[PDB]
Every structure is written in structure tokens, then in C-alpha cells.
Design a protein around this ligand. Structure first.
Ligand SMILES: C[N+](C)(C)CCO
Ligand SMILES: C[N+](C)(C)CCO
Length: 338
């Protein structure tokens, strides 16, 4: 998954049919509960798996500060993973021991066994509980950006950045549980490795061109080199800092020719692109600030409104906010948090 992607988490509480809540949410990405302690298995597992696209599974911990118990739970969890997924989550929110360092150690041993089994470990919890019962920093030192924290606020079923949990290493944010558990992604999944490419980059007075292994080179086309996309001139030079209309959709190629994804500052205007590079028009919120973007007839416009208190103030590109707010009631657009 990519930044701002959504996913739902479920357990027996959601029953053998979750097609409805996946439709309401608008995604099939799910993290399903497999086990609890060393004896409980979520009965709806296979059904919930079948009805969605799992990105991970979670275990409800009951080991407290006992490392030997955490090991037995991790193993029971592992022995029941039904299919390969990138993540296996440690849901630590109950029965903490009075000894925070012991809680941390058991949590670390649990996460370590998940990592040794070939998965990316995730620590799930709530800020206050984590603050009182463990040293999440000691966890991040061994497992960077491995946190999945919950923080609902009003819990009205929507993502409200005003109540966004402040902690380092937060990978996922469960922003609500109102109807069902809703989560939004803050960091792209990792992909360390994939070294070398299928050619060599060449630079010169005219810019950069790519010499493929066989001597040829891309031109008048898009092409994925490394993990990123680029568009090449009819001469084989990749575009830089430029807009490109391709197939009725707009794309922006950054300073390094790399196709933009997510938020990107062009000049002094903000624009938001699909995970596939296509510009997204209309209302889109970046954290606390709202942007109404449009590209009709190729006229790129970014209407910025900075939040201040209980209001949003329009900011004319002349660098000045109005004296009074433009709106105190947020529009119903795409919410992004990173
Ligand atoms: C060489 N570029 C700057 C064009 C990008 C890939 O390294
Ligand atoms: C389709 N593009 C080549 C424009 C990029 C997304 O894969």
C-alpha cells in the first residue's frame, strides 16, 4: 500500500460477511484478526480472507511483560497465518504488567519472531496506553516506522487530522471505529534492495538519456527505470520540471525527471497526483489545509486555504490570507495525511 491508501481491520465482531463494510469504505484492503493468547482463533478468518485483499493479520496479545509467553503466542499466531502477506501485527492494548521495560522486551521478542519468520512486524495500540506501559522508542530503534496507532477523537467515522496521534514511526493510523475500523496509510511500504537497473544513465549538455543494456534507449514514451517512472523526449531525454498531458490526464515530472505522486509543489502552488501519477482535481485536504485544484483547458490552478482555529482562510497567490475565514464547514473531498 501507498501513502493515503485506506484499509479496514476486522475480527469475529464483524461476522462472516464483510462485503458491505468494504463497499462502504471503498477498498478491499484488510488486516484480519487471526488469534488471541495461545488458544483463541477468530472463526471468521477464512471467510473474511476470501471476501477481501488482506495486507496483513493481527494478534491480540495477552502476554503482558512475560517474554516466554509472548514467544508461545507469536508461534501460535505464526502457525495460523493462512497466506503470505507483508505484515503481521502485534495488537498490544490489554493486560500490561506494572513493569514497562518488561512489557517492551516481550513486545520486542514477539515482533522479532515475526521478522525472523519473514514478515514486517507492526506494533498496534493507543498513544496513552503505549505511553504508560512501554517504551515505544526502544521498539522503533529495532523496527523503524512500525507503528499502527489508534486515535479517534470525536469518532464520527471520518479522518480529522486535528486529532492525529503525535508519535514517531507511525506507519498506519486507525482514525475511527464508528461503524467499523477505518485506517489510513502514512508511509509507502518498504522495498529495500532491487539494486541495479536494465541500463546506465547518461548526462550531457542536453540533459539525461537512458542507455539500456542492449544499447537502445527510451524515447517518445514512458518507462520504469529503478522503481520510478519517467517520460522521454523524441530525442531520448527525460522531461524535468514539466507538465505532461497523456491520455487526457495530467502528469508532473520533477527536477530529476521522476514522475510525481502524492503532493508536489510546482512553483509555489500545491498539486496532488494519483499513485499512478495522474493529477487529482477538486477538493483534496493535506493534513489541516484544504486545496481546490483544477486543470481545465490546461490552466493549472491551486486554491489554497490555510486552517487557523475553527476556520480556513483563502490565500491569494499574492501571499496574503483574508481577514476572515472563507469557511468553517469543511467540504466533502479527498482526505490525505501525508
Ligand atoms: C539521472 N536522473 C537524475 C535523471 C534520475 C535517475 O538517477
Ligand atoms: C501509466 N503511466 C505510465 C503514466 C504511469 C503509471 O504507471
Amino acid at each position: 500500500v501507498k501513502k493515503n491508501d485506506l484499509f479496514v481491520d476486522v475480527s469475529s465482531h464483524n461476522g462472516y460477511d464483510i462485503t458491505g463494510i468494504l463497499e462502504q469504505m471503498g477498498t478491499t484492503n484488510t488486516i484480519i484478526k487471526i488469534s488471541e493468547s495461545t488458544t483463541y482463533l477468530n472463526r471468521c478468518l477464512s471467510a473474511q480472507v476470501e471476501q477481501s485483499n488482506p495486507i496483513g493479520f493481527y494478534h491480540f496479545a495477552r502476554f503482558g511483560g512475560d517474554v516466554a509467553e509472548a514467544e508461545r503466542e507469536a508461534q501460535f499466531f505464526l502457525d495460523n497465518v493462512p497466506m503470505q502477506v507483508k505484515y503481521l501485527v502485534l495488537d498490544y492494548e490489554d493486560d500490561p504488567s506494572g513493569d514497562a521495560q518488561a512489557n517492551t522486551n516481550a513486545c520486542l521478542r514477539f515482533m522479532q519472531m515475526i521478522a525472523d519468520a519473514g514478515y514486517k512486524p507492526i506494533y498496534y495500540s493507543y498513544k496513552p496506553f503505549t505511553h504508560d506501559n512501554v517504551d515505544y522508542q526502544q521498539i522503533l530503534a529495532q523496527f523503524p516506522n512500525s507503528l499502527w496507532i489508534a486515535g479517534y477523537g470525536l469518532n464520527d467515522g471520518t479522518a480529522n487530522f486535528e486529532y492525529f496521534p503525535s508519535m514517531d514511526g507511525i506507519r498506519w493510523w486507525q482514525y475511527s471505529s464508528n461503524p467499523f475500523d477505518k485506517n489510513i496509510v502514512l508511509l509507502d511500504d518498504e522495498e529495500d534492495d532491487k539494486p541495479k537497473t536494465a541500463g546506465t544513465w547518461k548526462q550531457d549538455s542536453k540533459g539525461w538519456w537512458f542507455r539500456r543494456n542492449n544499447g537502445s534507449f527510451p524515447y517518445n514514451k514512458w518507462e520504469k527505470i529503478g522503481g520510478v517512472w519517467y517520460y522521454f523526449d523524441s530525442k531520448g531525454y527525460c522531461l524535468t520540471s514539466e507538465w505532461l498531458k497523456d491520455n487526457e490526464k495530467w502528469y508532473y515530472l520533477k527536477d530529476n525527471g521522476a514522475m510525481a505522486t502524492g503532493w508536489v509543489l510546482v512553483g509555489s502552488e500545491w498539486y496532488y497526483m494519483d499513485d499512478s501519477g495522474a493529477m487529482v482535481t477538486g477538493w483534496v485536504k493535506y493534513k489541516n489545509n484544504w486545496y481546490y485544484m483544477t486543470n481545465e483547458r490546461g490552466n493549472m490552478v491551486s486554491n489554497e486555504f490555510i486552517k487557523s482555529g475553527k476556520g480556513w482562510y483563502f490565500m491569494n497567490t499574492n501571499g496574503e490570507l483574508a481577514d476572515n475565514p472563507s469557511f468553517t464547514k469543511e467540504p466533502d473531498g479527498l482526505i490525505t495525511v501525508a
